[PDB]
Structures are given as structure tokens and as C-alpha cells.
Amino acid sequence: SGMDEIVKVLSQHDRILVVGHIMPDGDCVSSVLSLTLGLEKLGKEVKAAVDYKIPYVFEKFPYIDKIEENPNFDPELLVVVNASSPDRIGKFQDLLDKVPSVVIDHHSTNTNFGNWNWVDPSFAATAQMIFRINKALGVEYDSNLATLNYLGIATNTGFFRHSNADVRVFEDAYKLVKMGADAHFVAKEILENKRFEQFKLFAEVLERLQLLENGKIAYSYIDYDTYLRHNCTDEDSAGFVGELRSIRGVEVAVLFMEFPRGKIHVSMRSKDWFNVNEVAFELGGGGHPRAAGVTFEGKKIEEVIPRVINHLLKKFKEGVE
């Protein structure tokens, strides 16, 4: 339930598979690698896995190749990090009935699907919880480990810009930079790594932009054929919904992205007050008050857009009193 029990369980087991969520992000990579490396420093036999391609922006990060897609491994313990439901780890959810499991997560909707669960939504990033676990285990940080742990705190707060960048976030960042975290490397690789093809793709997104409610709601979409024409994938569009939110006067931005064929990811971002996690959760996804999402399979963009936007529109209009 709490950190102390999870530390004990981690200490009790030797052969550990650490698993993160599909469509991984910086906090997934950060949490998986920081815990994996910490456990290896203790002398444990560990592998790391995500049922998804790792985005190109992580290619230069130290030890990124320890995250596998198809590990061959006989674990005594499964550790699932940064993932709110079993569906979020893809094919590794088949291990949940076979191998004892620990969940470590900061999402408030986490279904507590492990044998042991430490879920604390007062953190901005699961990487903050791994930092505390590692310190409680006595793991000594070098600059690479500090850089890897800094990654998730930076990305989940928008590099200290979002509503979740509180005192504890800045304190953790300071501690990690003091330990040698390369904050410039992290920002360069995540934020200054744009393929030029992105700009043309984003122009098409602006072309298709739709405005509702005096311009306070904005949404657009990228169908699969459009990714193809621009020689782009979902890795290329990762910053787009935040760019739509940055438009003056917009309170909610929504981007629908079909990649690969038939899989529609819906990203939602809000600015001052609208709780987008409430919309996402009711649609079957999850997230946070200012950033949330949901994913559909086998469905048509002509049906997802009205279903999502009509539900969002209703909840937005109700949010006035």
C-alpha cells in the first residue's frame, strides 16, 4: 500500500521484470530505466520491457537499449510502473495471473491491479516515486542515473511549466541536478529534435482546425493517410496538442490521431480550469486535470470525433455556474 511495503517486496525478490506502458512517454522511460538500473546496482537480475516502439527522441539516452519489446525472461516478480490499468501494458498483462506483481504509479484512476500497490496522485511523475524508492534502497546515483530520473519529472511537468510543477517537483529537480543530471541534454533531445517534416504536418493540423464556444474549444485530426503523405508517424505529432493549447483564448485543445491504421488516439489539454481527465475517464481512458487521453481501435474517425467532442461539449457547458 505504501512505499515502505513496496521497498520490502523489491528487496525480497531477485529476478525482476520492470514493465511500463504502451505509447511510452518520458515518465515511462524514466521510471522503467531508473528502477531497473537501481535494482541492478543492488545485484538483482532485471529486465525491462514495454510492448511498443520506443520513440526516436530517446535514442541517445544512456541504457535506452535495456528496454526490450520481446524479452525472454523467467521473472519472480513483475513491477508495473506509470500505468493505470492492466490494458496499459499491452501483452504483458498476461503475466498478471502468473507472476506476483507490484504497481508503482501516480495516476488517481489506477485500478490497484498488483498484489502490492503504491499509488500516490500527489506526485507529478512516477519518476518521483522511483527516486524515493531508490534512495530508500540505498542506490548510489551517478550522473547517468540522475539524468534518467530527471527525465520523467521534466517531461511530465512540461519542463516546469504545467500546473503540477509544485515545490516538491522543483526540489527533486534541484536534488537530481546536484547529483549530475544533464538537464540540457534532456531538453535538447526531447524538445530540440524536430524533423522538418513536422512543420508541414502541423500546418495541415491548423488547416483542419475547428473552433467551438467562441474559440475556447479547438480540435483537429490527422488521419493515417496524412501521416503517410508527410513521411511522419505518431512520434512526429507528440507536441501538437500542446501547441494548439498555446493559442490565446483557447481553454481546451483536442487532437485526434489515427496511427497506425484503425487506431485513433485522442489527446486532450486544458489551460485554466476545465478538467479533461473527467472527459477521458468517462470515455474509457484517463489522465490528469489538464492533460488526458483515450484510445480507440477498429473505429472510424467520423464516429470518434462526434462522440468525443459532443461529450466534451456537454461537460464544458455544464462547467459554468
CA gap 117, 43 in Å, rounded: 24
CA gap 179, 173 in Å, rounded: 10
For residue 15, give the H/E element and its range: strand 15-19
287 binds ligand 5GP (CB under 6 A): yes
Largest CA distance in the chain: 59
For residue 299, the minimal CB distance to Mn ion (Å) is 22
195 binds a second copy (CB under 8 A): yes
| Of positions 9, 177, 212, 301, contacts a second copy by CB under 8 A | 177
Dihedral class, residue 112 (left if φ above 0, else alpha if ψ from -120 to 50, else beta): left
If contact means CB under 5 to 8 A according to the sort of partner, which of ligand 5GP, Mn ion, a second copy, none does residue 285 touch? ligand 5GP
For residue 175, give the H/E element and its range: helix 167-178
30 binds ligand 5GP (CB under 6 A): no
90 binds ligand 5GP (CB under 6 A): no
- Phi, psi (degrees; rounded to nearest 5) at 102: -115, 135
For residue 287, the minimal CB distance to ligand 5GP (Å) is 3
217 binds a second copy (CB under 8 A): no
The C-alpha cell of 266 is what? 485522442
CA 299 to chain centre: 23
For residue 12, the minimal CB distance to ligand 5GP (Å) is 29
| Of positions 62, 71, 100, 158, contacts a second copy by CB under 8 A | 158
The C-alpha cell of 57 is what? 527522441
25 binds Mn ion (CB under 5 A): yes
What is the full DSSP assignment across 254-284?
EEEEE-STTEEEEEEEESSS--HHHHHHHTT
For residue 285, the minimal CB distance to ligand 5GP (Å) is 4
- Residues 268 to 297 in contact with Mn ion, rule: CB under 5 A: none
Where does this chain bind Mn ion (CB under 5 A)?
Answer: 25, 27-28, 82
Where does this chain bind a second copy (CB under 8 A)?
Answer: 154, 158-163, 165-167, 170-171, 173-174, 177-178, 183-184, 187-188, 191-196, 199, 203, 206, 245-248, 250, 271-272
